[PDB]
Symmetry: D2
Subunit: 257 residues, 4 copies
């Protein structure tokens, strides 16, 4: 019997690559994201284009694209649909967050209201939904993607970086509370990754002059690739490492060290 791996926001960021890598390791996948083709605001790899590659790797694919992951209902709905299809949930990769930057005294009630939703509510409702089935099974592995800024909340990223630290804080407590059930909850915070999502936050967009200045701010003088991030993320979701929980791993080329 093939285990199941849930990957939220799987139309972009690490989802696609992680989906291919998790399939190779013998997992069935339940991708969540934005339904659509390459010409979409939040889609860089479509479901159908993915389902054909994951099927050649021997994986069945449930897809979910009609849930507000910032609410209890949307998260519980996703999990209820995952369990009726496959009847199990062994791994969950909850990608969370809304990026908002600027001066702390220019932040508005709306910005403050919506950064808590992306960075904290997605984590709280996401974990309340994925854990119950893992607790009953006696084994599970979760990876909550927060942000490297949570490890070092810096100026001009105050509310965004602070709430991410709160997310990592929740992850630690939750990772240790359910460790005695064989369920692992860990956090992975990235920064300076090579994907269009981060290219929108920083006005580099492949610009050689602006790209070089961004690559200069990281100790390893390069941006991270989704092939690298998927490898380490799968290491915490493929049952090959069951001795880490409640921890936060900075993945930013030495930036968050």
């Amino acid at each position: 019997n093939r285990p199941v791996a849930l990957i939220t926001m799987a139309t972009g960021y690490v989802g696609p690559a992680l989906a291919r890598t998790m399939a190779d390791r013998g997992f069935d996948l339940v991708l969540h994201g934005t339904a659509g083709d390459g010409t979409m605001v939040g889609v860089e790899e479509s479901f159908d284009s993915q389902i054909a590659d994951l099927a050649k790797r021997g994986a069945d694919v449930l897809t979910i694209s009609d849930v507000d992951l910032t609410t209890r209902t949307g998260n519980q709905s996703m999990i209820e649909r995952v369990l009726e299809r496959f009847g199990r949930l062994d791994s969950a990769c909850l990608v969370t967050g809304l990026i908002v930057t600027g001066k702390f005294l220019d932040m508005t009630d709306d910005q403050w209201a919506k950064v808590k939703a992306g960075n904290l509510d997605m984590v709280f409702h996401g974990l309340q939904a994925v854990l119950p089935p893992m607790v009953a099974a006696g084994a599970g592995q979760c990876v909550v993607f927060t942000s490297a800024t949570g490890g070092r909340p810096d100026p001009m990223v105050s509310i965004y970086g602070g709430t991410r630290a709160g997310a990592n804080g929740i992850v630690r407590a939750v990772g240790l509370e359910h460790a005695r059930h064989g369920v692992q909850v860990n956090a992975i915070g990235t920064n300076y990754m090579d994907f269009p999502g981060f290219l929108k936050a920083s006005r580099a967009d492949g610009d050689p002059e602006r790209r070089a200045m961004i690559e200069a701010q990281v100790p390893l003088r390069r941006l991270g690739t989704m092939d690298e991030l998927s490898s380490v993320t799968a290491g915490l979701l493929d049952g090959s490492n069951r001795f880490q929980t409640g921890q936060f791993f900075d993945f930013s080329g030495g930036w968050g060290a």
Copy 2:
């Protein structure tokens, strides 16, 4: 003229002792308080008994008891009133939070909203109100009280400790973002303190067998007094130390070491 120091939730916890020593250090006082049934500090010393003593120490007191610090309007209104009374704001001690404990999967949507309001809203709107008058003056010292759990979000205090950890991160960024203006924003996190609030929550206010057990959980084998906590807090708000900002300080007899 005398420097002005604001103290929130000043009827309990560190408020009383802090105002006593700050007056001894030459500060005028703005004491904020609340008797709302849903508040964590409580009423340990009434403003009626405090203004009497603090006036014997040479301080003029402004009292505020009709503002909700979980909202922008309440905080902004509170700062309108201090600047009309004294025309300046130098030090600010923002006590925040709303205690909620339990197993992560037993948390309700309102317990999750009550902790976001106490632990994060009071800080976002509190800091957005005290900083402008300090930045204009080019000087200022702020201390926001979070909790020792922010440095170690443990099981059974997942969303409390977690949101405290998010507030400590906000403090880090804000304390650095406004360091250029000579503004200090630090955060103190306490635990195992000797005051009616904690004594009653742990059911050790009239129990010797309980206190002995409770105190054995602190490396220093005792509960911290408010004179100790005010002495440490006053050193970050009396002008004697202008070289620490954006930092978190554990105050728990080593529990958070």
Copy 3:
């Protein structure tokens, strides 16, 4: 043109397991350790027996067991022999440390001198030996095994825990000082692992119920295996992840969260 992977104290702990998986990933190997067989003073797997298996996995092997890794000579010499055999060093796993425990005030000038040599001198000399060949090549992946006590130096393990924390600090700085040359240097710190060393130093066999008392102390209620550890270790040395450096990874089932 297979890349080379150096592993030290490869007769026990992670050495044996790591070698196999590194061989599985296409690495020629250089193994340091002691001579003997059958846990004969730290020999969990004799070199004679390892090369046999590592050869079936298509990996050449060089053995070194006559150097003192607490000195500049032994380390600089060990690398002289690695490069004359293969002419390259792409990965290095430096295992370091001599265990000492007891009351801090009962420690002697001898115990203090010993733990410094195992926990600090080995790291300092080791890194000065493996880095040069990687800096020249422009690529390299190093891992220094310290101890989970380095993330939380506790009583009864003061000098041992502190010196480990010193090792981590070095690894942090060194990992950042050479990230611009494309060289990674990270640290792993374990505790409660299922291997003769910890088992003997914790009364594993003899009071076998004591093992249950020890497992109760780990959040995940188990001892880690060298397969899990080698999988994580290999992931920082197999070239799949080149976006982390100067970081410390606790590996103690959450005990260091």
Copy 4:
């Protein structure tokens, strides 16, 4: 009548002078250890001849100790033996430790490595071993070990120095927790960008405003810390007013180590 005793090492510079004045104001008798001599000497920012005079006007007696090697058991053990014979008690101790060593990690020699270990680690291990017995017997005591803000963020060009300082904090943490049940506190203060010679020389900005202008700009609060500020914070951990912190590390670098 009966005054508490406070031991301060390396008292001729850094924080010792400003710390000795505020401790005496708080009613403490003092034990000053330093590399004694006149102001014209290296590391001597304020001679004991002048310090002792100032502290007596503040109502504090003073004992001087200037012939011990604080990197060895014999030195610290002797220092404390002479402290007890004079005052019969030891209540507070501020152990200043370390020896600055910077540069690229590869360029580090066995002698540099051996020396940063003796300054950042040997002084801590032996110092705490000598200070704690009388404090434990007295059921109460407070120690502050001065490491370095680098211990909180070991950066490039300061590897072995910051690394060993990190270990120093780790020892302070373990030792601070192990003896908390005896009423004894041990904490660590790590500073940087302080306005005093030792740092001004290391940073290569002693007589240069242009370079110091750059140095201060590296600090969030855009200035260098003063010994009055540091002595104030330090005295709070040694004057009996705060007995609820131990095994902790306090960064004091204007936000640089936040």
